[PDB]
Amino acid sequence: KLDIKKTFSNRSDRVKGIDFHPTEPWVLTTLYSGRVEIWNYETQVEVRSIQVTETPVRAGKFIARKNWIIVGSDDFRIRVFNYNTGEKVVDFEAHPDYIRSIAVHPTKPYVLSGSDDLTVKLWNWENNWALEQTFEGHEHFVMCVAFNPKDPSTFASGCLDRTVKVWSLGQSTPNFTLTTGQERGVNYVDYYPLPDKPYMITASDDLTIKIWDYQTKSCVATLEGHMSNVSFAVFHPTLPIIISGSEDGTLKIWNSSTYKVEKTLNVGLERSWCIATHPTGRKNYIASGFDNGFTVLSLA
């Protein structure tokens, strides 16, 4: 049963990136102010925070197996910090324009960055963070990158050019380009993580969320109801729901079978920008970042 409890919410500057640690009860937030925070959401104490830069940090992820956080900011730079010591492991210019999104491979030492420079870049931390590949083809800002968890030799990029492109690590052209019909662009793309459906999901400034079968390229469903830009939409990894968030200030939970809204939450933090789901469904935790802070919720 859906039984939504607020486990921890705190106010801060606008949070643009958010991520859960897989084994510690921690959430990373990356802020428009250039600050990043790691909170223990069970004790409600900060474990570490860093003023990384003075520009927005739009992307941030844990790399748990290396005890790192990796962040990307509007100063064009990727930085990596050890969260146990605070050491800055690396700091390099990744793109000649804003970084929108960072994804990390589940097993291999690879990080993808998507940028306003129209590209996705692949960096290898076992090769001194060498640029190993640039994926070219998109025609506007690359807003989101996500590995396919069932086949992480492939990944998806969501773009303001109104397409999603799915790529193979070996290869210079997309395996396919999805024409979303979301004419104000794609802000977010996510994969359904379970093996029973080959589904992806896209969110747009055109107020819609769409579900896609990536084998046939068909639109399975269109989810309508948000009243401003949809910043993200994701499949919960465990529960049969989809969770979206919007500049309309709401989170929406949708039934992933009927595609009808189940719950709309106004958490009171103004516009919603980002989402994380706990890597293994611990307490069904989700977390979202907003204009005025973040919240960590237990869905039941």
């Binding site: 606008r14 428009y32 804003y98 306003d116 800002f141 807003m143 303001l160 802000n187």
Partner: peptide, 6 residues
């Protein structure tokens, strides 16, 4: 000209 600046 840059969109999504916020």
């Amino acid at each position: 000209e840059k969109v999504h600046v916020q």
